[PDB]
């Protein structure tokens, strides 16, 4: 329920430092950019194909709609 009896943890040592001793943005770009491209590469092949086929269905529906409103060349006479 509360802190004290949540889990049984043994032999685990945690080290932390003070926020005033350390930095808020430690290598925000030189390590942030490889991390964000790592995450994008790991989770890019599960979202991008559905979204691009949504884009294809959207543009094909718009194109077919515009050809449907276009004049039929069968009825010249």
């Amino acid at each position: 329920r509360e802190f004290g009896n949540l889990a049984r943890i043994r032999h685990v040592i945690s080290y932390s430092l003070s926020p005033f001793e350390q930095r808020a943005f430690p290598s925000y770009f030189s390590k942030g950019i490889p991390n964000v491209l790592r995450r994008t590469r790991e989770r890019i092949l599960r979202v991008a194909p559905p979204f691009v086929v949504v884009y294809l269905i959207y543009t094909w529906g718009n194109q077919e709609f515009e050809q449907s409103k276009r004049k039929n060349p069968a009825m010249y006479e």
Partner: protein, 160 residues
């Protein structure tokens, strides 16, 4: 040396069998990390196993100099007798550093930090919280001792 290596390993096991010394060493480690003040007095077990006689002799010839030693006597001791006994036996300990090099104490950086050794099988929890002290020669030590006397100490056997 080998027998005392076995003895110091056994006493290390007895020391971390006790619990306030573990928190004492953990507090010094997390307080003076990166400095020679974090490392414990008894050292690590790997240093226990790899220390040899040459390093002990180097330490003895480096840190047992005369100007860093005080022969202090108290009680029924007569000062002139103590002085002539020191002159007879204890005079001329080293007097030389054999390299013209006296080691110096660099200032130790105190880092605000925390170390948490969670092991729930122990029946009681020991927590030590500290800040940086003033030093030995600082005049505020008496005032801080007054404040520590005001806060104080207690255990479960006090009858107050």
């Amino acid at each position: 040396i080998e027998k005392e290596r076995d003895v110091i390993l056994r006493e290390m096991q007895e020391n971390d069998a006790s619990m306030q010394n573990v928190v004492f060493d953990y507090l010094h480690a997390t307080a003076f990390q990166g400095t020679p003040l974090a490392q414990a007095v008894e050292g690590p077990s790997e240093n226990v196993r790899r220390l040899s006689r040459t390093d002990l002799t180097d330490y003895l010839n480096r840190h047992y100099k005369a100007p860093r030693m005080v022969l202090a006597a108290a009680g029924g001791v007569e000062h002139q007798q103590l002085l002539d006994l020191a002159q007879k036996h204890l005079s001329s300990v080293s007097r030389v550093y054999e390299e013209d090099a006296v080691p110096g104490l660099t200032p130790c950086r105190f880092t605000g930090s925390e170390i948490r050794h969670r092991d729930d099988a122990l029946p009681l929890a020991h927590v030590a919280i500290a800040v940086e002290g003033p030093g030995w020669a600082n005049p505020d030590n008496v005032t801080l001792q007054v404040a520590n006397a005001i806060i104080g100490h207690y255990d479960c056997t006090y009858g107050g």
